[PDB]
Amino acid sequence: QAAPNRPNYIGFRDNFIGLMYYNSTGNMGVLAGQASQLNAVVDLQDRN
Amino acid sequence: SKEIPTPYMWSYQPQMGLAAGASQDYSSRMNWLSAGPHMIGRVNGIRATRNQILLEQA
Numbered sequence: 027q028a029a030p031n032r033p034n035y036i037g038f039r040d041n042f043i044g045l046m047y048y049n050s051t052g053n054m055g056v057l058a059g060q061a062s063q064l065n066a067v068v069d070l071q072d073r074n
Numbered sequence: 075s076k077e078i079p080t081p082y083m084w085s086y087q088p089q090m091g092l093a094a095g096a097s098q099d100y101s102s103r104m105n106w107l108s109a110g111p112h113m114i115g116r117v118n119g120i121r122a123t124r125n126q127i128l129l130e131q132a
Contacts, residue, residue, distance in 0.1 A: 062110075064108060064109075064110065065108045066108060068105065068107065068108050
């Protein structure tokens with residue numbers, strides 16, 4: 027005897043979270059001026 | 075650093091009613107590290123007011 031399997035749907039996440047390293051210093055991404063030597067995005071661990 | 079210090083805030087003792095030993099204020103600081111000259115001379119102009127309000131309040 028044989029039953030159909032337990033279905034799933036490997037899709038992308040809701041609203042494309044889990045694709046960008048947010049809020050985690052350690053491979054963190056920066057908006058800045060081109061000649062600025064600065065950030066405008068510094069992240070913290072507890073912030074979501 | 076030495077000139078505009080972040081003020082020592084106390085802590086309340088509920089049992090004895092005395093002062094529980096103070097601590098550096100570490101929960102109101104601006105994150106001015108991502109700022110050029112036209113604001114880090116403004117942020118230091120803010121802390122230099124709360125270090126003068128707290129002396130005209132004391």
